[PDB]
Amino acid sequence: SGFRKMAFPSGKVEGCMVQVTCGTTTLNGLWLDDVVYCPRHVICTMLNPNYEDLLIRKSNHNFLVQAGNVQLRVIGHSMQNCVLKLKVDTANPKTPKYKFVRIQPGQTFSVLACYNGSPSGVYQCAMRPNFTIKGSFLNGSCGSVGFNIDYDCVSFCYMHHMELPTGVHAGTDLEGNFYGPFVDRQTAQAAGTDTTITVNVLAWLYAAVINGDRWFLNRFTTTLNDFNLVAMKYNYEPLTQDHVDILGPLSAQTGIAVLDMCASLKELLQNGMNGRTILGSALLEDEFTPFDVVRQCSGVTFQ
Amino acid sequence: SGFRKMAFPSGKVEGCMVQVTCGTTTLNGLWLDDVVYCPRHVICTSEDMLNPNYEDLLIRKSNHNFLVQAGNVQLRVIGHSMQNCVLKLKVDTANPKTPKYKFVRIQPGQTFSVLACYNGSPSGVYQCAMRPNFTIKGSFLNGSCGSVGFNIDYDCVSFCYMHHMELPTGVHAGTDLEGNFYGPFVDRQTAQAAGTDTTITVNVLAWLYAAVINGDRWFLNRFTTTLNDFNLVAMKYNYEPLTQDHVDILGPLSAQTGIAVLDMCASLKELLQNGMNGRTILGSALLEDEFTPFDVVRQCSG
Numbered sequence: 388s389g390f391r392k393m394a395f396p397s398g399k400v401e402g403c404m405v406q407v408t409c410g411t412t413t414l415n416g417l418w419l420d421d422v423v424y425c426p427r428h429v430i431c432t433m434l435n436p437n438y439e440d441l442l443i444r445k446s447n448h449n450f451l452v453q454a455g456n457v458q459l460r461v462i463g464h465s466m467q468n469c470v471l472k473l474k475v476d477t478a479n480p481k482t483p484k485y486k487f488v489r490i491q492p493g494q495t496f497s498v499l500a501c502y503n504g505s506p507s508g509v510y511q512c513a514m515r516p517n518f519t520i521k522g523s524f525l526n527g528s529c530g531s532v533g534f535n536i537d538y539d540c541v542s543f544c545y546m547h548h549m550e551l552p553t554g555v556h557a558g559t560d561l562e563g564n565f566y567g568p569f570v571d572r573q574t575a576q577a578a579g580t581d582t583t584i585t586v587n588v589l590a591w592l593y594a595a596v597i598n599g600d601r602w603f604l605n606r607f608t609t610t611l612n613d614f615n616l617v618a619m620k621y622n623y624e625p626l627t628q629d630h631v632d633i634l635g636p637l638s639a640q641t642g643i644a645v646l647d648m649c650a651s652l653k654e655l656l657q658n659g660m661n662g663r664t665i666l667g668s669a670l671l672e673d674e675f676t677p678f679d680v681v682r683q684c685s686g687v688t689f690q
Numbered sequence: 691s692g693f694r695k696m697a698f699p700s701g702k703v704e705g706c707m708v709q710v711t712c713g714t715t716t717l718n719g720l721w722l723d724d725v726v727y728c729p730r731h732v733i734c735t736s737e738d739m740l741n742p743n744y745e746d747l748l749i750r751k752s753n754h755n756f757l758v759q760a761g762n763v764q765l766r767v768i769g770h771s772m773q774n775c776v777l778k779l780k781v782d783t784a785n786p787k788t789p790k791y792k793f794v795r796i797q798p799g800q801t802f803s804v805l806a807c808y809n810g811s812p813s814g815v816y817q818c819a820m821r822p823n824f825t826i827k828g829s830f831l832n833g834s835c836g837s838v839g840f841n842i843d844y845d846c847v848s849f850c851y852m853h854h855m856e857l858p859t860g861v862h863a864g865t866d867l868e869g870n871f872y873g874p875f876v877d878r879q880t881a882q883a884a885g886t887d888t889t890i891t892v893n894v895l896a897w898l899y900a901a902v903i904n905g906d907r908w909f910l911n912r913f914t915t916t917l918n919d920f921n922l923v924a925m926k927y928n929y930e931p932l933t934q935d936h937v938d939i940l941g942p943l944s945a946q947t948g949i950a951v952l953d954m955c956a957s958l959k960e961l962l963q964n965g966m967n968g969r970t971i972l973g974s975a976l977l978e979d980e981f982t983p984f985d986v987v988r989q990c991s992g
């Protein structure tokens with residue numbers, strides 16, 4: 388038993404991480420097959436950069452790419468949105484089975500924080516409703532990646548590009564499209580007002596009941612419309628029928644209907660915790676998806 | 691900036707995990723060079739779990755009784771030895787993925803990364819602290835035993851924990867990689883209980899320093915304290931004593947923030963007296979004790 392914030396095993400991604408140096412800027416790149424993916428702001432020397440014009444002036448030899456103590460030869464460069472693609476002479480022999488996916492707000496992934504192309508640590512993040520992540524990133528962290536594992540397949544969903552003034556983080560998918568209304572430029576930008584990921588809070592309350600924490604359960608049920616009136620008032624994301632459907636398994640297992648669990652959450656929002664905890668937390672946690680709870684409580688493995 | 695419960699990258703440990711089967715019992719083993727380390731209770735039967743004579747059970751075992759699997763490859767056991775509560779299975783093939791490694795016995799308050807495994811395959815990685823009562827707050831299901839706790843210094847894996855048991859309060863106990871249990875626990879089904887747990891005071895102070903480095907000062911105050919006056923208050927909230935060693939260890943974080951250790955001790959004293967009053971620190975409504983001074987410096991300073 389027990390319940391922890393659990394990251395995916397990072398080994399398949401560790402063997403893809405390289406160092407990319409251009410001018411004075413060093414950051415990380417992702418080496419898959421014969422291409423290194425990294426943030427395009429590596430070329431910058433910043434208020435209003437013309438990325439296409441700056442890239443035309445670059446040659447292949449301007450990009451120093453190192454896999455450990457081995458220099459890779461760049462034989463081509465191209466920009467895809469906010470991501471630079473450096474074609475190299477060698478295919479990565481450690482390339483895992485992979486694909487590029489775009490995640491939706493409320494989805495979780497594992498971040499492999501890297502410095503100088505060397506993996507430093509791994510942690511679990513949720514894409515916030517305001518399209519930021521609450522990461523942990525120092526100088527040289529950019530090009531660190533976020534992923535999920537399904538069977539033997541790494542799904543890359545995030546590359547790290549920037550920190551906003553409130554100390555939260557923003558980046559792109561591996562096709563270089565920003566999550567949220569951000570640009571890779573030194574100009575005034577702010578994270579929007581954030582909201583709580585309601586479906587994830589319910590999943591975590593189900594996790595609490597599976598681990599024998601039940602003091603918040605009650606006799607009452609609510610309706611989706613009445614719950615959503617309360618959700619709106621407390622800066623919670625609307626609960627949809629899709630969310631109710633996805634919580635179906637945990638509803639069946641615990642014998643607590645989703646709208647019955649919604650009646651518990653409604654009371655917690657109105658009345659607070661009353662000095663009590665849930666799974667060692669004095670607040671409602673929203674960075675576990677229904678699937679995160681099932682895979683941790685079932686012991687799904689990755690080979 | 692930012693502050694997260696951060697594990698070490700698990701790849702160097704993933705390449706060491708194997709499956710070990712004896713009879714109907716399957717658990718995990720750690721394959722380093724030509725030795726597989728696993729919990730000795732793999733040799734136990736359901737009849738004899740209250741009072742197993744491990745020496746007597748092991749002499750009865752043949753090498754072919756031990757089914758060891760690395761992916762889709764059976765390893766041949768050519769020798770076995772028991773060191774304390776750990777079984778060392780000598781195999782014919784050395785692990786080509788063996789990293790640079792050390793075995794270290796850690797002290798209470800020390801943190802490490804757990805690679806939770808089933809059937810020799812990794813499920814996930816998370817951070818744990820060795821609690822003052824010599825338990826860890828893990829996440830472990832049937833077949834999790836032989837999962838290891840580790841830290842990585844540069845390219846070198848320090849193995850500090852092997853998972854052996856769950857206590858009736860749902861917390862976890864295990865051994866170092868020489869097979870010595872942390873705490874008074876034994877690998878037997880006989881009634882055992884964790885002692886009363888206490889909060890790792892030096893770790894709470896490290897975390898308050900992390901909060902200041904991340905630009906939060908709301909909990910600070912104008913007061914100082916003596917070490918003995920701090921300890922008399924902390925004890926009443928079931929906090930571990932703060933020693934001069936702990937004050938010395940917090941020296942670097944004190945230098946960076948310009949907050950004297952005994953000044954930060956006065957802030958924690960007030961937080962214990964008042965609570966947080968609808969505020970959070972680093973996204974938490976409680977005082978977090980599972981970050982060491984060392985964890986804070988590597989995450990906040992590089």
Ligand SMILES: *C(=N)[C@H](C[C@H]1CC(C)(C)NC1=O)NC(=O)[C@@H]1[C@@H]2CC[C@@H](CC2(F)F)N1C(=O)[C@@H](CC1CCC1)NC(=O)C(F)(F)F
Pocket residue numbers: 414428524525526527528529530547548549550551552556570571572573574575576577691
């Ligand atoms: C990648 N290495 C860095 C981000 C890391 C470094 C640190 C410590 C600030 N936190 C990180 O996550 N990426 C950047 O620094 C990016 C690049 C280069 C400069 C600028 C624009 C960019 F996207 F091209 N940038 C930022 O992160 C700036 C963005 C400003 C928009 C309003 C903030 N961030 C900052 O300057 C700061 F200090 F607010 F975080």
Ligand SMILES: *C(=N)[C@H](C[C@H]1CC(C)(C)NC1=O)NC(=O)[C@@H]1[C@@H]2CC[C@@H](CC2(F)F)N1C(=O)[C@@H](CC1CCC1)NC(=O)C(F)(F)F
Pocket residue numbers: 388717731739830831832833834835836853854855856857858859862876877878879880881882883
């Ligand atoms: C390793 N696979 C398991 C422990 C995992 C399985 C689960 C779900 C209980 N949680 C885990 O972390 N190890 C054991 O089961 C050990 C072995 C075999 C039986 C017994 C003694 C042992 F150490 F040799 N054991 C236990 O974990 C028992 C210990 C009892 C003494 C007081 C409890 N635990 C339990 O029976 C229980 F239910 F409390 F967790």
Ligand SMILES: [Cl-]
Pocket residue numbers: 795796797800
């Ligand atoms: Cl230690």
